[PDB]
Structure formats: C-alpha cells, structure tokens
Design an enzyme around this catalytic site. Structure first.
Site, PDB file in Angstrom:
ATOM      1  N   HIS A  95       0.936  -1.270  -0.317  1.00 13.08           N
ATOM      2  CA  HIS A  95       0.116  -0.442   0.401  1.00 13.08           C
ATOM      3  C   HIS A  95       1.105   1.293   0.023  1.00 13.08           C
ATOM      4  O   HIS A  95       0.468   2.268  -1.050  1.00 13.08           O
ATOM      5  CB  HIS A  95      -1.150  -0.210   1.649  1.00 13.08           C
ATOM      6  CG  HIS A  95      -1.544  -1.415   1.180  1.00 13.08           C
ATOM      7  ND1 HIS A  95      -2.777  -1.480   0.420  1.00 13.08           N
ATOM      8  CD2 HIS A  95      -1.505  -2.338   2.296  1.00 13.08           C
ATOM      9  CE1 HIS A  95      -3.299  -3.032   0.730  1.00 13.08           C
ATOM     10  NE2 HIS A  95      -2.515  -3.664   1.759  1.00 13.08           N
TER      11      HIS A  95
ATOM     12  N   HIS B  50       5.330   6.464   7.338  1.00 12.84           N
ATOM     13  CA  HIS B  50       5.046   6.699   6.050  1.00 12.84           C
ATOM     14  C   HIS B  50       3.519   7.528   5.312  1.00 12.84           C
ATOM     15  O   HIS B  50       3.429   9.065   6.287  1.00 12.84           O
ATOM     16  CB  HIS B  50       3.293   5.310   5.881  1.00 12.84           C
ATOM     17  CG  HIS B  50       2.160   5.511   5.999  1.00 12.84           C
ATOM     18  ND1 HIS B  50       1.788   5.431   7.474  1.00 12.84           N
ATOM     19  CD2 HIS B  50       1.136   6.636   5.892  1.00 12.84           C
ATOM     20  CE1 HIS B  50       0.449   5.989   8.128  1.00 12.84           C
ATOM     21  NE2 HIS B  50      -0.057   6.407   7.299  1.00 12.84           N
TER      22      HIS B  50
ATOM     23  N   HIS C  28       1.469   9.282   2.370  1.00 14.44           N
ATOM     24  CA  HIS C  28       0.402   9.108   0.802  1.00 14.44           C
ATOM     25  C   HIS C  28       0.603  10.270  -0.342  1.00 14.44           C
ATOM     26  O   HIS C  28       0.812  11.020  -0.430  1.00 14.44           O
ATOM     27  CB  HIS C  28      -0.829   9.143   1.022  1.00 14.44           C
ATOM     28  CG  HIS C  28      -0.751   8.407   2.490  1.00 14.44           C
ATOM     29  ND1 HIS C  28      -2.513   7.060   2.377  1.00 14.44           N
ATOM     30  CD2 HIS C  28      -1.050   8.555   3.306  1.00 14.44           C
ATOM     31  CE1 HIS C  28      -1.809   6.852   3.962  1.00 14.44           C
ATOM     32  NE2 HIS C  28      -2.010   7.691   4.796  1.00 14.44           N
TER      33      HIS C  28
ATOM     34  N   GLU D 245      -4.465  13.199   1.475  1.00 12.26           N
ATOM     35  CA  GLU D 245      -5.172  12.623   1.872  1.00 12.26           C
ATOM     36  C   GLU D 245      -6.574  13.818   2.949  1.00 12.26           C
ATOM     37  O   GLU D 245      -7.739  14.516   2.518  1.00 12.26           O
ATOM     38  CB  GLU D 245      -5.210  11.781   3.168  1.00 12.26           C
ATOM     39  CG  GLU D 245      -4.584  10.774   2.389  1.00 12.26           C
ATOM     40  CD  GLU D 245      -4.632   9.673   2.959  1.00 12.26           C
ATOM     41  OE1 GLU D 245      -4.736   9.222   4.395  1.00 12.26           O
ATOM     42  OE2 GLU D 245      -5.024   8.659   3.034  1.00 12.26           O
TER      43      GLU D 245
ATOM     44  N   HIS E  96       2.219  10.895   7.394  1.00  8.93           N
ATOM     45  CA  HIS E  96       2.194  10.488   9.046  1.00  8.93           C
ATOM     46  C   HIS E  96       2.802   9.653   9.234  1.00  8.93           C
ATOM     47  O   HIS E  96       3.444   8.163   9.166  1.00  8.93           O
ATOM     48  CB  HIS E  96       0.524   9.794   8.723  1.00  8.93           C
ATOM     49  CG  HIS E  96      -0.507   9.926   7.500  1.00  8.93           C
ATOM     50  ND1 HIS E  96      -1.488   9.374   6.989  1.00  8.93           N
ATOM     51  CD2 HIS E  96      -0.733  11.259   7.465  1.00  8.93           C
ATOM     52  CE1 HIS E  96      -2.045  10.127   6.228  1.00  8.93           C
ATOM     53  NE2 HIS E  96      -2.346  11.596   6.893  1.00  8.93           N
TER      54      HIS E  96
ATOM     55  N   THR F 202      -7.025   6.393   8.121  1.00  8.94           N
ATOM     56  CA  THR F 202      -7.207   6.414   6.728  1.00  8.94           C
ATOM     57  C   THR F 202      -6.874   5.263   5.906  1.00  8.94           C
ATOM     58  O   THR F 202      -7.479   5.200   4.944  1.00  8.94           O
ATOM     59  CB  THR F 202      -6.664   7.435   6.459  1.00  8.94           C
ATOM     60  OG1 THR F 202      -5.543   6.916   6.097  1.00  8.94           O
ATOM     61  CG2 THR F 202      -6.239   8.911   6.587  1.00  8.94           C
ATOM     62  N   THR F 203      -6.671   4.077   6.341  1.00 11.32           N
ATOM     63  CA  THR F 203      -6.942   2.479   5.681  1.00 11.32           C
ATOM     64  C   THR F 203      -7.986   1.211   6.240  1.00 11.32           C
ATOM     65  O   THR F 203      -7.783   1.423   7.191  1.00 11.32           O
ATOM     66  CB  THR F 203      -4.993   2.369   5.515  1.00 11.32           C
ATOM     67  OG1 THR F 203      -4.340   1.573   6.457  1.00 11.32           O
ATOM     68  CG2 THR F 203      -4.329   3.562   4.232  1.00 11.32           C
TER      69      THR F 203
END
Ligand SMILES: NS(=O)(=O)c1ccc(NCc2ccco2)cc1
Ligand SMILES: NS(=O)(=O)c1ccc(NCc2ccco2)cc1
Ligand code: NA
Ligand code: NA
Ligand SMILES: [Zn+2]
Length: 257
Positions: free
Chosen positions: A61, A91, A93, A103, A116, A195-196
C-alpha cells in the site's frame, strides 16, 4: 484484498469495513476560516532525539519506516493530547501527479503528498490495545509540496530501489525523523480514524499548517515503487490516498491565531 484501484479502492472498503461510513472518519477537508483558534491548546512537544528506526517495508500500500517502540524514546506529547504517545512508524500517501496525493485538504487544496507519523498512547500498553480505544492513537500529519529538495528525506528516497515490491524490506537504522519536520509546529486538530482499513476510530489527528518542500525528483522516486509483489505485473504505487470524508459532528481546532 483492499487497495487503491478501481475494483478495491476507497468506494469498496465499506463492504468489508462498515465503519468506513462511521461518525469520525478521516481524512477531512480543513476549512481554514471555520477552524477556530483554541487558546486552551498547548504547544506540540515532539521529542525525537532518541528515536531508533529499524527497518523500511513495502507493505503493498505504501512504505513504512518502523521504530523500536519497546521503550519510551521518540514521543509526542502536549498539544491536544493527554499523556504520552510513542512513535511506531511513519509512511506517506502520494499522487500520480503533483496536483493530488494528500489525504487531508486545506480549503479543498490537495498537496502532492502527506506524511503520517503514527504514535500510540502508552496508557494502553501496546499498539493492538491502543486501537481498541477512542484516544488510542495520535497521528502527526505533514503536507508535502514540490519545490526545493528536503535533505532529511533523501536517505528514504535512496533506499526505495531495494524495496520496490510488496513484501520487501531493508535495514533502516539511524534515521532521524526530525529531518522531515517543517520549521513551525502550528497545527489543526480533530478526532478521526485510520485512513486505511480497518479504518478504526482511534486517532487524535494533528495536522501541521506548514508544508515541507520536497523536490520533483524525490517524489518521482516514490512513484516508481510497486503495489504488486515480485514477478507479478507491474502496478505503480501511486494515488494511495483516501479522499476527504464527511466532517459530521466534529470541530477542527487551530493552535494558532
Ligand atoms: N471491501 S474491500 O475493499 O476490502 C474488497 C475486498 C475484496 C475484493 N475483491 C475483488 C474487493 C474489495
Ligand atoms: N494512514 S494512517 O496514518 O491513518 C494509518 C496508521 C496506522 C495504520 N495501521 C494499520 C493497522 C494494523 C493493525 C491495526 O491497524 C493504518 C493507517
Ligand atoms: Na469550527
Ligand atoms: Na527494549
Ligand atoms: Zn497514513
């Protein structure tokens, strides 16, 4: 089997994770004119000088930089938080192009990426217990815009070739996450979720107002990672972000006037 494609992305997640339609989902749009300054908030205390990074993992991911959280080392305190939250991983995004990837959004603006830094509340003993609590986690979110290079990011960029595909990891000791912060610690905060999947509603979100700048070359290397495993058809790891979710009965507070 969740992911970010047309057939398993954010619009599908609710079928296996019905909390996706819950009351405190993340991310959200931060409407800057209605986020009220709260004088009762405290300065954020980010204490990372003793951080012990261990490893970097492509989990199919994103990529996670993991830390030794077995003792109180790298911790987040203050701000909206009660007690002490221990850094476990960070991590990002990011997008397929510079005009999307974050996000959270700010007055509907999408940044090129979002970092994040994930922390768990030490009063619950372990991360797994913390994610059974409404105040179990604190995530420090930092926007990335494309401009000048971020020197403290380059060590991350340079290891990505070695973790191209899902399930690959590499040693990643002695990385200093202080090098990923902007100058200012002014922030917005609100109660939200992962958020996942599993989308658990455990998170005090702390989103810094000041973005960091990274170079086009740095973010381009993020976009060369793969969602797939070795030997499988190549699916570039891009657009691994969830869109903004309904704010519902929540308030976003600003730490700054
Ligand atoms: N609800 S979900 O996003 O975890 C999901 C799970 C399995 C499939 N299979 C296709 C598609 C989507
Ligand atoms: N994007 S994020 O910062 O909200 C975030 C942070 C941490 C996890 N962890 C996923 C996990 C493992 C067990 C339970 O949950 C997932 C998402
Ligand atoms: Na408000
Ligand atoms: Na230890
Ligand atoms: Zn995240």
């Amino acid at each position: 089997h969740w992911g970010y494609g047309k057939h398993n992305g954010p619009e599908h997640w609710h079928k296996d994770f019905p909390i996706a339609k819950g009351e405190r989902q993340s991310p959200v749009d931060i409407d800057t004119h209605t986020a009220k300054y709260d004088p009762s908030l405290k300065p954020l205390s980010v204490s990372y000088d003793q951080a012990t990074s261990l490893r970097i993992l492509n989990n199919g991911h994103a990529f996670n930089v993991e830390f030794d959280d077995s003792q109180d080392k790298a911790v987040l305190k203050g701000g909206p938080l009660d007690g002490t939250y221990r850094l476990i991983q960070f991590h990002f995004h990011w997008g397929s192009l510079d005009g999307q990837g974050s996000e959270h959004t700010v007055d509907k603006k999408k940044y090129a990426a979002e970092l994040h830094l994930v922390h768990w509340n030490t009063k619950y003993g372990d991360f797994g217990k913390a994610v059974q609590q409404p105040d179990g986690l604190a995530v420090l979110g930092i926007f990335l815009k494309v401009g000048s290079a971020k020197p403290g990011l380059q060590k991350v960029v340079d290891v990505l070739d070695s973790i191209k595909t899902k399930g690959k990891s590499a040693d990643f000791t002695n990385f200093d996450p202080r090098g990923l912060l902007p100058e200012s610690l002014d922030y917005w905060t609100y109660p939200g979720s992962l958020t996942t999947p599993p989308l658990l509603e455990c998170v005090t979100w702390i989103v810094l107002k000041e973005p960091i700048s990274v170079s086009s070359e740095q973010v381009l290397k993020f976009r060369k990672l793969n969602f797939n495993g070795e030997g499988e058809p190549e699916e570039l790891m891009v657009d691994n972000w969830r869109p903004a979710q309904p704010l519902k009965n929540r308030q976003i507070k600003a730490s700054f006037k």
